[PDB]
């Protein structure tokens, strides 16, 4: 496997790594024919996230050693990429290669080269069983719209309820279990929604902290976010699609 990122896509790769770090403690690397896959998983196995980087995202992309499934502490992979300010300013090209170690080379200005030799454990293909087509309800809006919706919520809030009120309103209620907490409810109209196919009365509840992790990445890139979901208990699917980039978060929802 030989990946090579140049130009502005260097920071984009860093934002994805940052985004996956707000979900799980280990980073799963899986080079595929249709691009490089970066995946992660909750400690409760109730959240799955995956970024797919199509082969044209890179300067050069060799997938298989003439197949690789990887597992690395994301604390490590973070420190390699942490602070995009130094990634924008200094790093020109970023090389990821593979033996005994996964190597990452940062070709900076003035001939300066930074090289990381991360240790890794071989693993399975971390895949979650999910299908957006199987979901009866769908939302779609620009990320910034959904980013303004979660704005009046405390960043310490773990959980939020997504529901469809009467009059085709999208309602976001904060969730708490029963010592009194502040309850915040956000109400959108169907107008600033590109697509809205969800039955009135339907409501689900998921981890807000993890949903934010996808938002932070898609807001900057100005992408379109679509949410697909079913009844309580069944997972919620949050999708992101560029020409260069694919990415989906699969979150668990509360029951009953």
């Amino acid at each position: 496997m030989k990946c090579l990122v140049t130009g502005g896509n260097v920071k984009v790769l860093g934002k994805a790594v940052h985004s996956l770090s707000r979900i799980g403690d280990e980073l799963y690397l899986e080079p595929l024919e249709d691009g490089l896959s970066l995946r992660t998983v909750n400690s409760s196995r109730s959240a799955y996230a995956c970024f797919l980087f199509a082969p044209l995202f890179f300067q050069q992309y060799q997938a298989a050693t003439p197949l690789l499934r990887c597992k690395i502490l994301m604390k490590s992979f973070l420190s390699v990429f942490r602070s995009l300010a130094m990634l924008e300013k200094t790093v020109e090209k970023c090389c990821i290669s593979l033996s005994s170690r996964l190597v990452v080379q940062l070709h900076c200005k003035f001939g300066v080269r930074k090289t990381h030799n991360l240790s890794f454990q071989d693993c399975e293909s971390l895949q979650a069983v999910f299908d957006p087509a199987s979901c009866p309800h769908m939302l779609r809006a620009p990320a910034r719209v959904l980013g303004e919706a979660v704005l009046p919520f405390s960043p310490a809030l773990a959980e939020v309820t997504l529901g469809i009120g009467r009059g085709r309103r999208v309602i976001l209620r904060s969730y708490h279990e029963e010592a009194k907490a502040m309850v915040t409810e956000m109400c959108l109209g169907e107008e600033d929604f590109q697509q809205l196919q969800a039955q009135e009365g339907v409501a689900i509840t998921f981890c807000l902290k993890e949903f934010r992790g996808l938002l932070s990445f898609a807001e900057s890139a100005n992408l379109n976010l679509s949410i697909h979901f079913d009844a309580p208990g069944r997972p919620a699917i949050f999708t992101i699609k560029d020409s260069l980039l694919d990415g989906h978060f699969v979150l668990a929802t509360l029951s009953d």
Partner: peptide, 11 residues
Amino acid sequence: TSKFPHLTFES
């Protein structure tokens, strides 16, 4: 709050 059903993964 933190009583989410497991996601079913392949392995």
